[PDB]
């Protein structure tokens, strides 16, 4: 698979410059200028057949042209069959994502569907990453999605939601891989927010609450357009890390971990959470 | 009331030399040596009453004395109230901010105008923070904004622009306060590349200097909607940090700090900004 | 079995603050190591080309100085440890007799009526469990279709654990580097029971449990060398996926290290 990476190709008078994340080149060949311009107007992935055709049309040797494009940071070639063949976004604000499927292709991210949580009869295919994004959080929504899809072969989930002044993105929940679920995450954050000066969350006050039907909403600051935009970018980059055009590799010790962002300071904190002792995700 | 700026006095028998951030002065009056020795031991702060007393005790006319202290950079007179009554955004992408003035009121941020950088005749009121935001960076754009507005009473400037995979927000440049400018960073950085002990022949300074020669701007690399939403939120929060601020209860480090955001990882790096002795902002 | 301890008895002494803090730390070292993540993750923070300068070196108490007391190698009566196996090949059948020999010599007393083991343990608590994973259909089996067992070192017996197929186990244990690993016959997986490591000594018990694991795999290295098996200790696996595949409960027990065994020919 050939991935087109971020770059610009700019021109003034007889001067043409290529600028990528890796390098900058004063371009002196008209054919390669043409190739770069066509690549710049395409989104993310290009068939090697079309790349070859593009190079042939500009009378450029395919091997030498490809080597130039790869070494300068215009394209890369990936080989790996990925773990989730598709992503879906399920949300209570699907309109926030109404352009995401088409935009995010140029980051190499395949999102097949934006699904409104209000939909009855939601279907998802094999080996799909399900991103559940909630502005108006309720634990029952997460429980419904798990109840419907946890048994889907190769499924995984990511959940995103707001808590106090933060945007939270849970670690990837993969039943196949045995990683912690949303409830493992939200209990870790609720514990940390208690002013107990204690890591341990359990006491008789907590045990008595665990008698009631497990359900909750979460306090959070009111969202404006800028908080939504920030969130939108974090979602995109996270999906990109997992399933899209990889620009920066992640260390194996934190690739599937949670990502939390303080909406005031804009500082991110990426943290692996443990399985919550009272959660049954491990037993399913 | 009065901020005492950092300075030195060196004495040799009856010879005294004063050096501030902007001046070097032979001090031959005994009274003024006593005023300066006192201010040097006071450590940042003094009331108008104590300054007036100190001047009277040293037999120096209060108005001549204070004009000297201000002009040579020993003191600055600044307000307890907010330094900037409002902000304007000047941009090459003003349509990005078409709802910012209305939206950001609920965050307590008051932006009075969004201004296209291509407008011929840009006017800005007194005591206004000018935020210059560029997707297409050229140093002469910043130079022309500085030349237009540096003498506006109470003015300050902040610049935001893109450097490869990073979005940079400069420190606050305030002529009144004597904080570093855009060029204290970028021209000093270019100096260090040009004057490297062993030049890196593949320095990014080569690109920047070639863009000057070719009369071209440095474009932001392949920005989409999400990168712009991320930038929009960072701008909002930085403006919020600068709102209601003064030397009365906001440290000078709030102004003399830059924020760089890697657009791939979404990680922010907040760094100190210092003066460059060679900068033209110090020719005063 | 005659030596059974219920974890109910252990948890009576557990400090839940210690347990949580230890688990929180422990999970920072877990890996997501899968073939499908090869182009988007990395393991070494040092580039491959610079690793040579760090491998098989000595750090000095007085850097820059060379005044040392030399010791003669004529006092050495030992065999060289064999190179760790790699590019394992499973073409030949491997008998249960060979695996049994590994287990009893590495982890058990020669006397079946004794409760002492060939490795010590803080407070004689022995918080590390050994699991046996069958990884090739060319490995003989005790119970048809059972590919994970738990070794009971005092009973000198194997307890059936899981009937996952040999391919699922192999995938989980070998992580991203399975092509280079090749095809081992079996693995040992050494697992910490958190509450058994912590209940007496608190935080220091974690440190003691990890050290104990190393004493255990080292016995296995030495025994394996003597019986003509090749072996490699291995950290390149996805901890949670190994746990799930073995049907371990990650709230109680976590895999610390994997050790592959087999032949190296072609």
């Amino acid at each position: 698979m050939i991935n087109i990476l971020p770059f610009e190709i700019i021109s003034r008078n007889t001067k043409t410059l290529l600028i990528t994340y890796i390098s900058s080149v004063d371009i002196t060949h008209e054919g390669m200028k043409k190739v770069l311009e066509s690549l710049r107007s395409k989104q993310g992935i290009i068939s090697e057949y079309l790349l070859d055709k593009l190079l042939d049309e500009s009378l450029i040797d395919k091997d030498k042209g490809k080597e130039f494009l790869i070494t300068t940071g215009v394209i890369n070639k990936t080989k790996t069959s990925p773990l989730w063949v598709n992503s879906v976004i399920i949300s209570d604000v699907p309109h926030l994502f109404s352009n995401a499927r088409e935009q995010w292709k140029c980051d190499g991210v395949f999102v097949s569907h934006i699904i409104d949580i209000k939909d009855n009869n939601i279907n998802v295919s094999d080996s799909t990453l399900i991103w559940l994004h909630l502005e108006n959080y309720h634990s029952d929504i997460v429980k419904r999605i798990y109840s419907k899809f946890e048994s889907n072969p190769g499924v995984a989930f990511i959940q995103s939601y707001y808590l106090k002044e933060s945007f939270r993105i849970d670690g990837v929940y993969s039943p196949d891989l045995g990683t912690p679920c949303h409830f493992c995450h939200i209990e870790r954050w609720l514990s940390r927010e208690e002013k107990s000066f204690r890591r341990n969350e359990m006491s008789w006050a907590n045990l008595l609450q665990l008698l009631k039907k497990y359900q909750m909403t979460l306090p959070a600051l009111a969202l404006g357009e800028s908080e939504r935009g920030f969130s939108y970018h974090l979602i995109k980059r996270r999906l990109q890390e997992l399933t899209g055009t990889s620009l920066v590799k992640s260390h194996v010790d934190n690739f599937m971990s949670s990502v939390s962002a303080d909406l005031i300071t804009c500082i991110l904190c990426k943290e692996p959470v443990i399985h919550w002792q009272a959660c049954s995700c491990l037993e399913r | 009331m009065i901020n005492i700026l950092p300075f030195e006095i060196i004495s040799r028998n009856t010879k005294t030399l004063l050096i501030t951030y902007i001046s070097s002065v032979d001090i031959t009056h005994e009274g003024m040596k006593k005023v300066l020795e006192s201010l040097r031991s006071k450590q940042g702060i003094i009331s108008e009453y104590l300054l007036d007393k100190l001047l009277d005790e040293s037999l120096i006319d209060k108005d001549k004395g204070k004009e000297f202290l201000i002009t040579t950079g020993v003191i600055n007179k600044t307000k307890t109230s907010p330094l900037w009554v409002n902000s304007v955004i000047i941009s090459d992408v003003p349509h990005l901010f078409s709802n910012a003035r209305e939206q950001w009121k609920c965050d307590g941020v008051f932006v009075s105008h969004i201004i296209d950088i291509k407008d011929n005749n840009i006017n800005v009121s007194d005591s206004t923070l000018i935020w210059l935001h560029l997707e297409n960076y050229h140093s002469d754009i910043v130079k022309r904004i500085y030349s237009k507005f540096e003498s506006n009473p109470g003015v300050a400037f902040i610049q935001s622009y893109y450097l490869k995979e990073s979005f940079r927000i400069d420190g606050v440049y305030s002529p009144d306060l004597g904080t570093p400018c855009h060029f204290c960073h970028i021209e000093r950085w270019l100096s260090r590349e040009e004057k490297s002990f062993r030049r890196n022949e593949m320095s990014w300074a080569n690109l920047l200097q070639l863009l000057k020669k070719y009369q071209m701007t440095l474009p932001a690399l392949a920005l989409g909607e999400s990168e712009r939403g991320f930038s929009y939120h960072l701008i909002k929060r930085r403006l919020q940090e600068l709102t209601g601020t003064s030397l009365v209860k906001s440290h000078v480090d709030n102004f003399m700090s830059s924020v760089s955001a890697d657009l791939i990882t979404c990680i922010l790096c907040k760094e100190p900004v210092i003066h460059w002795q060679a900068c033209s902002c110090l020719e005063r | 079995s005659k030596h059974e301890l219920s974890l109910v008895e252990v948890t009576h002494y557990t400090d839940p603050e210690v347990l949580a803090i230890v688990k929180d730390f422990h999970v920072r070292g877990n890996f997501a190591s899968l073939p499908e993540f090869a182009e988007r993750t990395f393991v070494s923070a040092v580039p491959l080309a610079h690793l040579e300068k760090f491998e098989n070196k000595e750090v000095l108490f007085r850097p820059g100085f060379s005044s040392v007391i030399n010791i003669s190698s004529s006092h050495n009566f030992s065999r060289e440890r064999l190179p760790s196996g790699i590019n394992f090949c499973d073409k030949n059948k491997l008998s249960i007799r060979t695996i049994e020999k590994l287990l009893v010599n590495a982890f058990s007393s020669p006397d079946p009526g004794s409760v002492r083991r060939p490795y010590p343990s803080g407070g004689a608590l022995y918080p590390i469990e050994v699991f046996l994973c069958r990884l090739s259909e060319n490995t003989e089996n005790w119970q048809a279709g059972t590919n994970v067992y738990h070794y009971l070192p005092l009973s000198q017996a194997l307890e059936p654990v899981a009937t996952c197929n040999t391919q699922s186990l192999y995938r989980s244990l070998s992580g991203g580097d399975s092509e280079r690993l090749g095809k081992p016959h079996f693995a040992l997986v050494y697992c910490i029971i958190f509450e058994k490591a912590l209940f007496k000594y608190r935080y220091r018990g974690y440190r003691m449990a990890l050290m104990e694991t190393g004493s255990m795999y080292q016995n296995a290295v030495l025994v394996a060398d003597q019986i003509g098996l090749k072996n490699r200790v291995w950290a390149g696996y996805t901890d949670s996926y190994v746990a799930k595949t073995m049907n371990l409960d990650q709230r109680t027990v976590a895999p610390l290290i994997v050790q592959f065994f087999g032949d190296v020919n072609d």
Partner: peptide, 20 residues
């Protein structure tokens, strides 16, 4: 390397090494 296509002006060596 020098190429027929243009002159390389700048390289981010850290990112090139990772494109390890």
């Amino acid at each position: 390397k020098a190429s027929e296509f243009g002159v390389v002006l700048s390289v981010d060596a850290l990112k090139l090494s990772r494109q390890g």
